[PDB]
Amino acid sequence: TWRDFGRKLRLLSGYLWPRGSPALQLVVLICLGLMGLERALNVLVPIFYRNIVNLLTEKAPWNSLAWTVTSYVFLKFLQGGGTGSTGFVSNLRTFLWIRVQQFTSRRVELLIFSHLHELSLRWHLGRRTGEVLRIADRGTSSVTGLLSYLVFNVIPTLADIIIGIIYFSMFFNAWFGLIVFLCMSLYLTLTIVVTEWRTKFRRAMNTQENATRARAVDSLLNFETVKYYNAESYEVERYREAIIKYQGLEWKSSASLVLLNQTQNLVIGLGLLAGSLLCAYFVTEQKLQVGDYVLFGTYIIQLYMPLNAFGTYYRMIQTNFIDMENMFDLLKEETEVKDLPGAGPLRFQKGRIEFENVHFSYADGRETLQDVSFTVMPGQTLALVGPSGAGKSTILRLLFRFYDISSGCIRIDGQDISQVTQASLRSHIGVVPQDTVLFNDTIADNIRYGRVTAGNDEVEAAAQAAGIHDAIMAFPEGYRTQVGERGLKLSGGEKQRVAIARTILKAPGIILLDEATSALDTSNERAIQASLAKVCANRTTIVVAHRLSTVVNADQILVIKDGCIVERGRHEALLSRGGVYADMWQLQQG
Amino acid sequence: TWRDFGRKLRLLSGYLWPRGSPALQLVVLICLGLMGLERALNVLVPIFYRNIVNLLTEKAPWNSLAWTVTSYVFLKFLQGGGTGSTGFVSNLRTFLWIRVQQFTSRRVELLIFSHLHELSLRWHLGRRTGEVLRIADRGTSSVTGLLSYLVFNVIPTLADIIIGIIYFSMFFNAWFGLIVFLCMSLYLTLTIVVTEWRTKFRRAMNTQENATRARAVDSLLNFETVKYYNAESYEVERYREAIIKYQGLEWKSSASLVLLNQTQNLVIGLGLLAGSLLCAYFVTEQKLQVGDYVLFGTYIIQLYMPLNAFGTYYRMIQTNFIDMENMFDLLKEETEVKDLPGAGPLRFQKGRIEFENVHFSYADGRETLQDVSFTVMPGQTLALVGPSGAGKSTILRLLFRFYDISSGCIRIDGQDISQVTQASLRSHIGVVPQDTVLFNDTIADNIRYGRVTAGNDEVEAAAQAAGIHDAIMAFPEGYRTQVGERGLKLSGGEKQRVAIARTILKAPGIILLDEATSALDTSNERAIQASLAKVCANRTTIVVAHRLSTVVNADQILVIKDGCIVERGRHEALLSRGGVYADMWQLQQG
Ligand SMILES: CCCCCCCCCCCCCCCCCC(=O)O[C@@H](COC(=O)CCCCCCCCCCCCCCC)COP(=O)(O)OCCN
Numbered sequence A, B: 001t002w003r004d005f006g007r008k009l010r011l012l013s014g015y016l017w018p019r020g021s022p023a024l025q026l027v028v029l030i031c032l033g034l035m036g037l038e039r040a041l042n043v044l045v046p047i048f049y050r051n052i053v054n055l056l057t058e059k060a061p062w063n064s065l066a067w068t069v070t071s072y073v074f075l076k077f078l079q080g081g082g083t084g085s086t087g088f089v090s091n092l093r094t095f096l097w098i099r100v101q102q103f104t105s106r107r108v109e110l111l112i113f114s115h116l117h118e119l120s121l122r123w124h125l126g127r128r129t130g131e132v133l134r135i136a137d138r139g140t141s142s143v144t145g146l147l148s149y150l151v152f153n154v155i156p157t158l159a160d161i162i163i164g165i166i167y168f169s170m171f172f173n174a175w176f177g178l179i180v181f182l183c184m185s186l187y188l189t190l191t192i193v194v195t196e197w198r199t200k201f202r203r204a205m206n207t208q209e210n211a212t213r214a215r216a217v218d219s220l221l222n223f224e225t226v227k228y229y230n231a232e233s234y235e236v237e238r239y240r241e242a243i244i245k246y247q248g249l250e251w252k253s254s255a256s257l258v259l260l261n262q263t264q265n266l267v268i269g270l271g272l273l274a275g276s277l278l279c280a281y282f283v284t285e286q287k288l289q290v291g292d293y294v295l296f297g298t299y300i301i302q303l304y305m306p307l308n309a310f311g312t313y314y315r316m317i318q319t320n321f322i323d324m325e326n327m328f329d330l331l332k333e334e335t336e337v338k339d340l341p342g343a344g345p346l347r348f349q350k351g352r353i354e355f356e357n358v359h360f361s362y363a364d365g366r367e368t369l370q371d372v373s374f375t376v377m378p379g380q381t382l383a384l385v386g387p388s389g390a391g392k393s394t395i396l397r398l399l400f401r402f403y404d405i406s407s408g409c410i411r412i413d414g415q416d417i418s419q420v421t422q423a424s425l426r427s428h429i430g431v432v433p434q435d436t437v438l439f440n441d442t443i444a445d446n447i448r449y450g451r452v453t454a455g456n457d458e459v460e461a462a463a464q465a466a467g468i469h470d471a472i473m474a475f476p477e478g479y480r481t482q483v484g485e486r487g488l489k490l491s492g493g494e495k496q497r498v499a500i501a502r503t504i505l506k507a508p509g510i511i512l513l514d515e516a517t518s519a520l521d522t523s524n525e526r527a528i529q530a531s532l533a534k535v536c537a538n539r540t541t542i543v544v545a546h547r548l549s550t551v552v553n554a555d556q557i558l559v560i561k562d563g564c565i566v567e568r569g570r571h572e573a574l575l576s577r578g579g580v581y582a583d584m585w586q587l588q589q590g
């Protein structure tokens, strides 16, 4: 509708006045003043011109005429090029604003890069990288740009037309003071009537646009596959057939503009005809002197120039508006798993975890995990075994509180999860992820990410827990070797080794291992678990392992089939029962 | 230096003539013409003004005066504001160019999205996503936004000054002429001197800029890690401390400009003073007439204003230059592993492979692979076993020819691979990668990527071989579900099952498996390898497996220690030897 526009402009205005620093809160006044003086000069230059022509007509000494001429030339210097150009009053402000603009830009940026890191997991696993980056880079340049064309080229221009009608009405004749008024009115009423009839087009451009780029920016973030299967053509072609349909529409909306920018010309044109013709009539009938026909020949032009100038800008102002809209959209989304106000930090003494009839659904259609309850005594290791797709990892994801349960209760150390602050909750737990990703930085700094204070001593010693010390030293330059983006450059298993080294360095109260021996050879896992046995002496540990050679000494064993527990107990007590665990053990060992 | 500018401009100008379609090769002439007419009207308006002032001075009938004024209110309509704005002999050109700025904004896009996909691996595993995207999205607007300010606002302006000096010399006094000439000369000699002094600054801005964004577009790609280990603040801060340095070094290059834009004002100023004083003097000494003063008071103002306007654009015309420079660099590089001239398709008959004393290195510091040779008969399944980091995957990488060798020879089916075209070579081999990635699309289209002409019936039949048909149908919406981005949405092992189904659908001449049973439970591996034994009836296979339970029936077994072959033979022939393979097998079996 035509009201939302208003709401939007209001918001953009809020970012002008700096809020916090007094000094700056002054520059924003002086600047305004210079704006004031220039408006006056605009109505004092034309007048002086009349004088230097009047005197010349009647004749006078070379002396008197001289001083007068100098005056005119001076004032032109202080205001050259009308509104929207250079000069000496104007450009003296563009040198006292550079500072304020750098206080608004920063603030906006460090706000669209904080929110993106507070949103929840569900949203993140569905975004389209391409877009979430385009929006965040062009966005911070929209707000600054517009706030500088709506306070320095629009509002000023408008004020001038008015000052004009006051004059040309109480200092010249009168009728002339009407010809100007009507012109403007029509100019406006021919803009609105047209701007609307165009919006039917601009709207159906943005949508197609954001979908004529996606596919592509997703065939460059997955290079390997587009090579193995030797495509590399199927792709280039598909693009061509999308850069065509988009173009077919922009023509429509890049021609409407030429129409709007031509109809306006006429309205202006007619105005000049009326005025010029009438003025001459009067001077013939001895009512206004010739001199005067010069004033109404300079003031006018210098008052209609601005309108026409905006003609070469309409194109951009549109684009900038669109981008602002998008950014603001994002800053209105809401986090899903929030925190309860008035919450206290967790009290950690032993580390006991208990589940109480938890039911969970992903897409509200089926229950992936349902009716699970277990208890772990402090200082004990629990293991989970089952077929693929049974829901093993969902329990670990839910313990860390990345999602919210629907029913039941989860309690640790006698305290429920839902009322303690997450920030204090996550400081007691460290987990090795299923897949390893490393920053595009050096291996030493990748290892140090567990805690940003330790010196090379601990990094070095902790490097011995995973058995990577004897391997890194053989590398050229030792621990300052590069890793590459996402860690693809390094190798296949030492990514897992450095991940487990990070976790060991962190040394949390409770340790959880999703997969640890996925990529290691059969002669390296043993040593790793032997080293880990000395570290897990007094810490609760949950381990998941498809291979059953690791949980033979597990303190407790659980079997998950389709999210419902099927049996439990130790190793030998499960073997004697002759159940599914015994069947799988026999199948694996013989 | 000051000559590179030359080569640069030459290129940006090699794009203003559609090279192909004829029709278009015409619009580019009529456009040029309209330019001509306008550059004339500019000297036929000031003149008419004088006439309507002379007549008024001496008196005349309302009739005659009337038919004169009309003229000076028509020519104004056609000319418009000036040399950089709207009108009616200008707009009519910006409506016949839209169709030529869309044949130069395509050709230059489907050329920076092709080259990025023919570069080789080394480069790719070392880029910085953040940047490569940017360079390729802002880049296609520079070369289409400068060609429009170097053939419609510069060259035109220059022509006008000259026409002015010709006149004002052979039609008016001829002494004034000198004034104009000198003024312009000085204007230029100041621009050149100042521009260079400034360059020292602009150069040291770009560099810091591209590095104040890296550690920021790389903490939004690897989201998980920035949560597990908490953080989420350590980051926001680092950003702030880098948005400060950049700023401090721009208030330098955003103030130099204000200086350059004030000096120029003075030079222009002086010119007007000289002229006016002189002209007035002559009119006193009876040489010119009042009428004449009016001409030298309108022509000048409309011959200097066009220049000042450029004062408010300098900012952008810099940024655009910088971006063009970068794009060119990318389009100026070179592929690493090219193809020998000529050459022909590979003559495949059976499927034999041979290695002949291959020595190769990665970074010229260490020898990753050295002294490797083997051979496979047409129909078996060689296997490789060894410790981690021994170089198992490098052999597979070197077969596909992603990198290149230093010595030795590689022969397939009797033909060396170094001369045969890679396009024909890579149509006979299909490999499941070590890490599985999926397109952000539906599962059916993702699994159809093996061959684009496949049908639903054969896709459904082939999905049964991997054992996933009985699993997908239980999902809601069946085969039209989403997999998210990169495939993190699906599961932990179903990605691997989908990848192996893709490979089976492709059905190449030679099959290679890096790791297939990494994420599968022990109850599903058997059925899978039994199913895979049926399709390898007449296809050579190479299999890598850390677990030795799937290699017991291998036709040939190799042991790779540190890239040097230690022993070879079958399974029982190696068990009796009592070597390292026997030790590993015992240790695994317990
Ligand atoms: C905070 C105080 C502000 C005081 C002044 C406010 C009013 C300023 C004058 C506005 C006159 C034009 C109003 C009608 C157009 C409004 C929309 C617009 O300007 O840009 C739109 C996009 O339109 C364009 O593509 C062209 C953009 C420029 C059009 C207006 C040009 C400037 C104003 C011209 C008249 C004012 C006098 C001359 C200014 C030289 C943005 O999207 P939208 O509002 O159309 O979307 C929702 C409604 N459909």
Ligand SMILES: CCCCCCCCCCCCCCCCCC(=O)O[C@@H](COC(=O)CCCCCCCCCCCCCCC)COP(=O)(O)OCCN
Pocket: B001, B002, B005, B009, B013, B153, B154, B157, B191, B192, B195, B196, B199, B307, B310, B314, B317, B318, B321
């Ligand atoms: C193909 C035929 C072209 C004919 C005309 C060619 C010459 C046109 C007039 C050029 C006059 C200015 C020459 C000196 C500046 C050249 C550089 C430039 O314009 O922009 C530079 C960046 O400078 C700026 O930031 C300001 C950009 C605008 C400066 C020139 C403004 C337009 C020309 C002004 C004089 C012409 C008459 C008035 C123009 C309306 C781009 O980088 P760089 O060349 O400095 O880097 C290597 C050399 N250091």
Ligand SMILES: [Mg+2]
Pocket: A392, A393, A434, B492
């Ligand atoms: Mg999992």
Ligand SMILES: [Mg+2]
Pocket: A492, B392, B393, B434
């Ligand atoms: Mg490997």
